[PDB]
Subunit: 461 residues, 4 copies
Amino acid sequence: GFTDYKVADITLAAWGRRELIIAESEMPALMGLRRKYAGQQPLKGAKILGCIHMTIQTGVLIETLVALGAEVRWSSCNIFSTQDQAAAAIAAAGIPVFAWKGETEEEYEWCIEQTILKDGQPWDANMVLDDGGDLTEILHKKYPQMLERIHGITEETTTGVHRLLDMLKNGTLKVPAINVNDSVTKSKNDNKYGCRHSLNDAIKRGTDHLLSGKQALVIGYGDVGKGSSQSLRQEGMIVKVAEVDPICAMQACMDGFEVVSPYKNGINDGTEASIDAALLGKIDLIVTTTGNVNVCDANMLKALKKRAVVCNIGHFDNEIDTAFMRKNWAWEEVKPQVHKIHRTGKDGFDAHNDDYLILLAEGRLVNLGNATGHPSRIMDGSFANQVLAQIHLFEQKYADLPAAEKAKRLSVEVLPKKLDEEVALEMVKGFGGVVTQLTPKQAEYIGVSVEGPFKPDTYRY
Amino acid sequence: AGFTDYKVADITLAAWGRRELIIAESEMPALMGLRRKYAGQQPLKGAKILGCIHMTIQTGVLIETLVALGAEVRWSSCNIFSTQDQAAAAIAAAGIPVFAWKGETEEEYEWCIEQTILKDGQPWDANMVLDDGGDLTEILHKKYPQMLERIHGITEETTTGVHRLLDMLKNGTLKVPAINVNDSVTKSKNDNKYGCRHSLNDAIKRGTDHLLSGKQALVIGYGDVGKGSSQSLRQEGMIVKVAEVDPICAMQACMDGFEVVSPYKNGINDGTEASIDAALLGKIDLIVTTTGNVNVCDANMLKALKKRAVVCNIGHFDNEIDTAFMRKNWAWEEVKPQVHKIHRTGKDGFDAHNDDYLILLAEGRLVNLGNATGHPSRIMDGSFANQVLAQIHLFEQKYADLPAAEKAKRLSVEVLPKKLDEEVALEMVKGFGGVVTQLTPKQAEYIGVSVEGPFKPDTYRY
Amino acid sequence: AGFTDYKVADITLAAWGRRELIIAESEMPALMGLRRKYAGQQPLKGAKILGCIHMTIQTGVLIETLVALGAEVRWSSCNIFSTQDQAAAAIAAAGIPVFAWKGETEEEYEWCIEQTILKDGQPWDANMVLDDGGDLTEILHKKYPQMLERIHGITEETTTGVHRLLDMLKNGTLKVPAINVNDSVTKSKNDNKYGCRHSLNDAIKRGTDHLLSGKQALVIGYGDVGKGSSQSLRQEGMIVKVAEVDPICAMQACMDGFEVVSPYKNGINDGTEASIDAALLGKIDLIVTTTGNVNVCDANMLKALKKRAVVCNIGHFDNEIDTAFMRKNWAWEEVKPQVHKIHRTGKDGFDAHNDDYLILLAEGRLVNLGNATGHPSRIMDGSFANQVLAQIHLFEQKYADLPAAEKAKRLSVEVLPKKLDEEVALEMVKGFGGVVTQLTPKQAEYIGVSVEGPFKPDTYRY
Amino acid sequence: GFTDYKVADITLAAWGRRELIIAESEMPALMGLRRKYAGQQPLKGAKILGCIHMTIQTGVLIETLVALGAEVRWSSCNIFSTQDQAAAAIAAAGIPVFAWKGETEEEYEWCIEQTILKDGQPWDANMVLDDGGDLTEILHKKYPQMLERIHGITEETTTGVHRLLDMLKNGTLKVPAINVNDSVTKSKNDNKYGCRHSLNDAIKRGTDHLLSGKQALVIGYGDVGKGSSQSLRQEGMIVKVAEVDPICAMQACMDGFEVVSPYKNGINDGTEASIDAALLGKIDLIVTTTGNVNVCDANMLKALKKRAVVCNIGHFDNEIDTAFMRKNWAWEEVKPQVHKIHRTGKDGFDAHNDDYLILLAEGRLVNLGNATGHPSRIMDGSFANQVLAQIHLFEQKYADLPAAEKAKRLSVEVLPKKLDEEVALEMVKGFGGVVTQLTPKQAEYIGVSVEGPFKPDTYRY
Ligand SMILES: NC(=O)c1ccc[n+]([C@@H]2O[C@H](COP(=O)([O-])OP(=O)(O)OC[C@H]3O[C@@H](n4cnc5c(N)ncnc54)[C@H](O)[C@@H]3O)[C@@H](O)[C@H]2O)c1
Ligand SMILES: NC(=O)c1ccc[n+]([C@@H]2O[C@H](COP(=O)([O-])OP(=O)(O)OC[C@H]3O[C@@H](n4cnc5c(N)ncnc54)[C@H](O)[C@@H]3O)[C@@H](O)[C@H]2O)c1
Ligand SMILES: NC(=O)c1ccc[n+]([C@@H]2O[C@H](COP(=O)([O-])OP(=O)(O)OC[C@H]3O[C@@H](n4cnc5c(N)ncnc54)[C@H](O)[C@@H]3O)[C@@H](O)[C@H]2O)c1
Ligand SMILES: NC(=O)c1ccc[n+]([C@@H]2O[C@H](COP(=O)([O-])OP(=O)(O)OC[C@H]3O[C@@H](n4cnc5c(N)ncnc54)[C@H](O)[C@@H]3O)[C@@H](O)[C@H]2O)c1
Ligand SMILES: NCCc1ccc(S(=O)(=O)F)cc1
Ligand SMILES: NCCc1ccc(S(=O)(=O)F)cc1
């Protein structure tokens, strides 16, 4: 009589299991590790608190971790990102999961606490898998005693890594972490190509708007901005790119984009006078990709072309000043995760008003909120890295080391390039690709082993 | 007035070269901004720079920037086919020693480098080296080691040259420090990739005027050059397949929409004709090597290629293709300079209407420079702004003046700091009319950077 | 509310449908411009239109435009899977007879068309037909021929429908004139191509959430739908191969950068398993049929496809794929609505973990409408502005009231004049914020056109 | 002792022969016609006046006509389009050719005259092959008696067809014509993909400018403007498109381009005030593609960004107001067919002036002027049509008809679709493409023969 879960509808489990079986065939690197390490059971004794979007893809990751011996308790890291049939299949497998699509903020926090607490007391957790740092934060701030037993954190995404490095710099990080984001088979796969697949996917599902011929402004040109700009350009949008980093802006120019600023001469002085109103009045779609705060601000929202679509694909919703819009403008729900924001005022709207914006997923990550996030064959790389990272920190056994050895190992590290390459090779074979083997003379000529690693650690790909 | 200390193809091309320099200067804002920023300070006064890099119009703007900052130079090309003769002539007419022409022999190539090293029959009192590929660096270490005692540093342009510096550093044979100019992002991820995107299809059209759309290409390699090369051909409508030994680069090729294949069955190169994927190579209209490695388009691949396929190399050296095999066994018919039909029917003569030939560009030497003009000015702007900054830095550090114990602590291969890489990029972006946004103080604090940058940790890969 | 003359899935979706209609109106400036232009004149006053076309949000705006101009209508969908239930509910809640829901059986499909034809058990006094594929046209000619005595014209949306009309005209069996709406440039080269570009990869993602980049696709056909479908996949990074019987379309595929292949050895489809290029089909991850032809993805191709390939059809009718063979021999496993795994291990039951299956989308029916929402409003604007102009033209001509000799001269299948095609395009361009330049008198005289257009001869192909 | 020619340098003939031998391997449709018709000699007795760019590809066309039985006398239809090695190879084969790169207007007219006159008297020509209509006009106006002997004209390009249709309208056309341009294997191959290949080719050879990241304005979006826009966009330019035809403008929007006018509201009233100076002041490259007059006018040239490149790929050099620039601005030759135009005045220039434009090929066809025009494998389709059109008209012997039968036969027609498909099939085989054969049931289902034509004549591809 398994009841240790909370999902929208347990009766979706059979559907979710059908999609898990399909997803498994799309995830050869992750399923390869499941088959490789099953005999060793390297996560026997691991008790993992997991906080990451409860999608079908996350389901294959969860069941891999359990297949290698772990126990887990799971929650989503976003109120809109859960696929309810994925959550139901995991719960019907007997795995504690607290997640549904459309949580309130209070339900979101309740779901994390349900993973942390078992029977009203702290679970004897000893591993953390996090995506964005919310679970990491709650443990350090509200359950610090639990971190005495925890061997490490494996952190999925750019924003969570930044938070770990701030903690490390300030002396507040209590356990070591692996930066999963910066494996090449994560950052330069998931963050870029994942958003290429899923950004225009979510815009179409949300609005069914034609994108070809229309004007877009992408704020940011890091890995997510690069993939997002391509998602839109390959549909035929005229894409303009904003950046604060001149190296990233240089890449945008060379990639064929006009680089512009929302602010005259790029100077954001906080006044309406600084807004390039002519530019913003021609933009049909703005997408924020930065991991920064208030990059689509109130004065920008006032100046945007009527009926423009606004969305965010960075981790947190504060990229767009949705607070200003809740305070001043009237919200008309079109359907779940799609709202018309009427700039005519706060108290009610005319149903035929033409002066509105369309906001997707209330400013939360739009690929997961309005579609299904990245596809399985892309998440394969990210999640193979997660598994390898969990194995590595669980085996290092930090929670048991003497203090001097803790000092040497309290760090945020990445996986070695050899492993990054082994993940990539399984991905390539999933496409039917054939990697050539160096001859001994050729390996000697460029100074590498025939087996790799093939590049110095400085190499940027 | 009596300047004779040069050797070029035709000095009367100087006026033409000067017109093209004046145009190129307006395409190179980072480099020309360095010229303006530092001219009064003369930070290279006293520098005596041996330069070895493709004697193009773009290199001319680099040379005159070094001279305008106070340096003296003596120059040669780093490839027998890459000089633009009008550029070398303009530089010579300006009274600057340059020894370079398009279509040098190997003996003339080595003579030209030695003319930069020697002045009036004796070693020039050089104290700086600017190199592209490592040949000048090698000749100095092997043949003129005494000159290195006075040299403060090497600024090395390209991936292959950096590899050779790092081999010397690990072997204990590198005598002076170096800056790896290649690995600035405004070099590696500008020049190596987008430069080849611009100039590869350029050189193939100039050499052959072949339609590329609808035809099959095989690109060997998918590093920065292979990425840019693959894009050069795909954007023309070619059906491009990619080979790689690096699974991470192979993963990128898959995700970028290319089929990843090996010339060898199951990727295993046992040296026999039997290991060749004859069915694959029999379909390929164009093969491009981009690896920096040896014999990646080998004799058995060449025998298996589709009749009338084009063969070329855009890596730094011609040993990527087994051209020696083709010289030894097959008859060469010159179509026009840097374009040869190689007839696979035998060595002693050929039927003029023979159908079983390959077209080789630039005799397997770097094809974008041999058959066209290499990277365009606005891309080389980034590379050469980095070169000027690197020259300034190593010259000001004065390594050659240190005691032996301190030289040992300073001997290293380094990259320029990120802040400079960003400053080059900013001038490039302004040259496109791009407008970079400035962080507010709260935004800078939120992501943990200074408002002025650097904006990324040194681990960032872009 | 008193009004019961409809049948939809759920009338309570009406308000949601109305919200989407108000958005779609802002995406359809040509259609809303016609509403405002002709509202006062009521040119369709007295028209009674039988309509049979995908009951989507876009069709809703079309319906309410005909009504706003004076017409009465009775509506059904031309496909069992293409209805958007909230669009049908909005139309029914506006008082408009509509019989349509997503997921009809075949018997229910036929019944819905008959409910538009009949009002209270007797033929409605229809006088106009709007059709998409020819099913309603066929039912009237076969089963209700008396009704055609009062009907002034048919306006036919799509290529397959027009083919059927032209065969009836040749055979002397077409009883009323038609307008070929499909062959307006703002329909054929807008809807058929760019609509499939937008909506094909859209439906595949919704149905399977598969990564497309780096995978192998085979598009059967390279007409307008095959062009837009091939681009839909290639822009995602698929490696796309194209099959054609028309060498001119195959030439376009080559120049567009696709490899042109046949599923049969040497292109010869003799019906044997030996004729199948099994090596080619064993590498294909996705096959899309775009032909309007029969059995272009046949039993032997289905047998030979790579395990776990996706199979779909974006032509009008589901017989492009041999789904009947799959129904007879293989076990179907529903993943979710309009997504089935087809287990090639046999008919009775399946292993839930079997690896040898295909994924079929929308049971072989038009996949963009079955698994997503079809073309976007801004593209359908062009098709449906043409539909409204075509309805106005044939209604005002009053074919059914003309003397016999006048009928004989007007019994034809025609396209709208090019001047109207241009006026639709102009509104579409303005909807993008584009600005069309006006010729000077001298420039107009020089190319031999009016400043107002038409700008091209009728022979022009764009 | 053959002397009946004039070329730049006859010693270039061996080079030209080498490139002809290579080009033949790139032109399977044209070489296929040599084999299919050699035995029958369909052009035995044809005497063809030919006027078209004397390129390597034209050399293969010429020698195909001769191999099928024709005699010819040849000139180029543009002063800059000749490849001198090609003209030399043709002269050395004993074929009268009068053409070199860099003719004056006087030499251009003289070269056409030498094809018309053999030994000071009109040659007994009975066939005409033209590209642009200059030879056709000269014969109608200056030697009308020779048209009593001529069976027809086969006209290569859109501008030339327009000029023929003016005469058919006015009743002043003396012989029938084949509109070769409007074969699909010409118009939608040569005019579009040909310019795709050769526009960015000529711009690189002429300027070596980076195109990625820069702003282009393409005037026109017919077949040449479509291919031109793609030539630039695929290099990473940000391309804007002007059109007067709203259908063509619709296609540009859908193809992912911003459609703009050089003039406010699109109204070309001839004033400086009409110019959108903000737009023109951002454009790095303008390309005219219209076949119309003065579509890049004096006020657009005055407003263009400093150092922008200006070129024309339409047939005639009056698309750009070069006359205005010759009268008012100082011209500095960079190298052959590349000039800087200094907007500081006419009385000389400062060698370091920054306020100049770069004009390519003096406003003449830039792909042939600064590069080599379309590649062999594209020109294969166009020229296979030219050969079939010459046979199609020669075998009909219009000049032998009585006046009443001539009237009935007098027309400007395209080749039937069956020939168009025959050319396309040979093109497809040259790529190694495999066309599928319809089954009888399938052919019956769509109402075509298994042997084609597969499309009604109304079809637009
Ligand atoms: N939705 C998804 O599936 C998904 C996937 C991966 C990562 N992410 C999230 O997306 C965000 C970005 O990730 P990334 O890996 O691209 O990071 P990144 O560091 O590579 O890129 C962020 C970029 O934003 C730029 N930027 C910062 N402030 C800006 C401003 N005011 N205006 C313009 N540009 C500005 C920076 O210069 C930087 O290049 C993070 O929150 C990350 O966690 C989301
Ligand atoms: N022509 C130019 O203008 C130009 C510009 C920049 C660099 N280069 C030269 O091009 C070469 C490549 O430079 P890069 O920056 O791209 O280096 P890189 O290290 O980024 O890429 C080289 C790639 O070749 C691959 N490779 C090695 N052996 C291989 C084999 N046998 N088969 C397939 N792939 C193989 C490696 O895995 C690697 O990814 C160097 O010689 C460099 O100096 C030329
Ligand atoms: N789903 C949609 O939204 C949508 C939109 C428009 C049209 N359609 C339908 O799509 C179909 C195609 O329409 P179209 O306008 O592209 O027609 P089309 O005539 O332009 O093209 C169909 C192509 O199929 C090719 N073909 C025929 N049999 C073939 C075979 N056995 N193998 C390979 N190629 C073959 C033909 O040569 C032709 O070029 C029609 O049924 C039409 O009604 C669907
Ligand atoms: N250089 C080459 O190799 C080459 C090849 C083929 C044709 N051409 C020539 O190029 C020209 C164009 O040929 P095409 O086949 O594209 O003809 P086209 O009729 O298909 O296109 C010309 C286009 O220009 C547009 N146009 C006319 N006046 C305009 C104006 N003032 N502003 C903007 N747009 C305007 C028209 O609407 C039309 O769409 C003709 O002179 C033709 O002979 C050149
Ligand atoms: N006007 C800015 C002057 C300037 C010009 C160039 C640079 S650099 O990036 O190429 F070192 C830096 C500063
Ligand atoms: N210009 C607004 C009036 C108008 C609105 C629509 C059209 S139509 O081409 O779409 F029938 C024509 C004219």
